[PDB]
Amino acid sequence: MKNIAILGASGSIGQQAIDVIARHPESFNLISFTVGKNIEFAIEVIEKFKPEIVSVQDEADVERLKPYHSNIVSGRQGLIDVSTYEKNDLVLNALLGSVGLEPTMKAIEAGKNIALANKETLVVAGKLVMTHAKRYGVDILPVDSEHAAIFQCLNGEDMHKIKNVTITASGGSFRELTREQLEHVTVGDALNHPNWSMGNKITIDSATMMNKGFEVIEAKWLFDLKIDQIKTILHKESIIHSLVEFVDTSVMAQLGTPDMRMPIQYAFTYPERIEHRAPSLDLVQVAQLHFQEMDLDRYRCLKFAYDALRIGGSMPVVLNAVNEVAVAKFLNHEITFLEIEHMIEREMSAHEVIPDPSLEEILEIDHYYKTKSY
Amino acid sequence: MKNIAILGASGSIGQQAIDVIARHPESFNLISFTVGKNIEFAIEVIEKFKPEIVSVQDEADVERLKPYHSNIVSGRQGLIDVSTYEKNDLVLNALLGSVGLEPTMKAIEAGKNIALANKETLVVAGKLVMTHAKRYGVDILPVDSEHAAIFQCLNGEDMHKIKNVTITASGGSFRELTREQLEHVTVGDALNGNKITIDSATMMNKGFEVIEAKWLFDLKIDQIKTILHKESIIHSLVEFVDTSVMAQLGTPDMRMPIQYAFTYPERIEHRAPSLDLVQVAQLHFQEMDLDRYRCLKFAYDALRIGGSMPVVLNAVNEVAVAKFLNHEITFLEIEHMIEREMSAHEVIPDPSLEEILEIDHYYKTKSY
C-alpha cells in the first residue's frame, strides 16, 4: 500500500490519477495533493480520500478548506510542503508551466520517486533534474504515452546495450496537406471553435510536430541517450508508441490504443503491473500499420528541437518559451501558421547560450522570452 | 565465460552453434559434445576447440578417437554423461527425435540450463520438462524466433501478469492458394531439413510452437493466440493484465536465435542489417483461418485433450510428411492422416517418459 502525492490534482491528468487511486484502494492511498483555485474539487477529494495535507494557490482560499481539514497550506511553499511530505512514496507532478520545477527538485532531495506529467520539467531543465535524481537515488517515471512505451521496452534491459530509440508520430492535424496548403491554413482549420474543447495548445504542437520535438528532448535526458540514438518515424495509426533497437539488432516495441490511464497506473505500480479493465488492442481489426520517413523540411519544429539538443545549455528553454508565445499568438489570430516556426527560429538564432544554467537562470530566461516584445 | 554442451553437433544446427562459439571465444567455451557416426567431423571439432568429453553413437568408433582423445563415452549413456557433465553451463539439445528426451531430463536434474533446437522435446513432453525445470530452477529456451520474441517481451516482467501471448504466422508458401488449389500441390512446389520445410507450408510448425508456449509460459489454452502476419516482422506479442502490449520485431532470420539462446538473458552485438520500417512501409494482420490451416487446429485439439495426444500429433505428422515427400500421398492427405490417427487414439492421462517413447515409436513404426 503506497502513498501517492498529486501536484495539480484538478487538471486533466491529476483527475485521471485520482480515478486510478479510487479504482485500487487496495494498493494506493492519496496522502497529499494540491490544486490551484478549484476549491470545490479539493473539497470532494478531501471527503472521499482523506489526505493528510492539502495545498492551494491562494492564501485567501485556505479559510474555505479549514472546516474540512486540519492541515492546509498555500502558495509556492505549500507545493513544497506537499511534494516533500515525508509520508509520500511517489510524487505525481502534474503541474503545468515552470511552477512545477522547484517542487520536483525539493521532492528529489527528500528522496521521493517522481512521476512526471509535466513536459516543461525535462525540456527546460532535463540535465538539472536527472543529475539530481541520480545523486539522490530516485526514479523519474514518465506518465506520457511514448516515454511510458520506451520505459517498458527497457525494463529488464541494460541501457548500455541500446542501439537507438524511435518515437512514433501521427503527423498531426495537417499531415494530409501539401507544404503549400500549409501557407494558407487558419487556426480555424485546426480548431473549429477554440472554446469547445480542451487541449488547444497541444493540438497546435501536434500539427507543428513541436510535441514530438519536446518528447525527443525529454527522452534524451530521461534515458541518458546520445543525440544520434534518438529517432522518429511517422506512424499514421499511433498503435506502436515507440521502438527500441538493441545492439543485437533486436527491436522491442510497445503497442496499444490511447488510454491515458494506463501509463499513469503503470507509473504508480512500477515495476509491478496490476489489472486494468479496458478493451484489448485488436490488430486484426486494425488490419494495417503504416510507416514513412520523418520529413524535417516539412516539420521544421522537430528540426529545431534537435538543434536545441545539439547546442544544449539554455537553448531548449528558449525553444519552449518562444513556442508557447507563438502558439498563443496563433490561437488569437495574429500570425499565420507558418509564422510559428519563423518566430521560433529567429529567437533561437539570436539567443546567447548560457552554460549549464542554474535553476534560477532557467526561470529568468523562461520569463524573459515569455514577456519580451515581438 | 559460459561452458556450452552440444548434443548433435554434426548437423546444420550443431555447425551453427559451433560458429557462434568460434566467433565469441571470450563469451563461450565448447566444453562437451555429441556426434552420432560422423567421426571425421568430431575429430576436427576436437582439433579446434578443446572439448573435455565427447560421445559417439557406436561403442565401436571409440577406438579411432582415443589417439585424438578427449575423454570418450558412447551410446545412450554417453549422451547422459555429456548432458549432465558437471562443468556444463548450458546444453544445446540438437538431437533429432526422441533420443534427446532422456538426456535433457537428467541435465535438468543436474541443475543445467537447456537450449532446445527441436520442437519435439516440449511438444511430446512439455508437462514433464517444465515441472522438472521448475523444481530445479533451470532455464528452458527453445531456439526459435517466436519463443525468442516472447522471452524478450518478458524481460523484467512477471510471467503471472501475462494476459495473452500472440504468435504470428506468415501463412506459409501456399498462403495465397485456396483450399481447392491445394489439391494440385506437388513436392517441388512445396520445397521452396525437408520435413521442417513442409511443416511451414502446412502450418504444423506454428502448431508445435503453440504447444511449446503453453507449457513454457504455463498458460491456459485461451491465453495462447495466433494471427496471420504476411510480412513476418512482428514475431510475437505479449499482452499483460494492464492491457499494455509488448512486441519483438525484426527482419525474418535464423542466425540470431542460437546466439540469443547462448547469451540469454544478456544481449551482445550482432552485425546484420537493421530493421527499416520506412522501407517495409506496411504491416498487415488478419484473423487466423483454422479451416484453411487445419494442422494448427489439430495442435489446439491436442492441447485441450492433453496427455499423450500431442505425442500422437507429432509422430503421425512425421510419418505423413515423409510419405508426402516420397509421393505416396497428396499434400492434402497429410492433414487427413493426422486427423484419423488422432480420432482413433486412446489417450494416456499423465504418461511417464517411457510411455511417451513407446507411443512415439508405435506411431512412427506401425503401418498405415
Author numbering:
A (entry chain A): 1 to 374
B (entry chain B): 1 to 192, 199 to 374
What does the publication say?
The first dedicated enzyme of the MEP pathway, deoxyxylulose phosphate reductoisomerase (DXR; E.C. 1.1.1.267), is rate-limiting for MEP pathway activity. In contrast, nonprimate-associated staphylococcal species, including S. pseudintermedius and S. schleiferi, utilize the MEP pathway for isoprenoid biosynthesis. S. schleiferi DXR is a physiologic dimer with each monomer related by crystallographic symmetry. The monomer consists of three regions: an N-terminal α/β-domain with a central 7-stranded β-sheet (β1-β7) and 7 α-helices that serves as the nucleotide binding site; a middle region of the protein that includes a second β-sheet (β8-β11) and 4 α-helices (α8 and α12-α14); and a C-terminal α-helical domain (α9-α11 and α15-α18) that locks FSM into the active site.
To establish the structural basis of FSM action, we solved the three-dimensional structures of S. schleiferi DXR as an apoenzyme and a FSM complex to 2.15 Å and 2.89 Å resolution, respectively. Comparison of the S. schleiferi DXR apoenzyme and FSM complex structures reveals how the C-terminal capping region (α9-α11 and α16–18) shifts position to allow for the α10-α11 loop to position Trp196 adjacent to the inhibitor. A DALI search identified multiple DXR from Escherichia coli, Plasmodium falciparum, M. tuberculosis, and other microbes (Z-scores: 49–51; r.m.s.d. ~1.6 Å2 for 370–400 Cα-atoms; 39–40% amino acid sequence identity). Of note, the staphylococcal DXR enzyme appears somewhat distinct from previously characterized orthologs, particularly in the α10-α11 loop sequence, which could be explored with additional SAR studies.
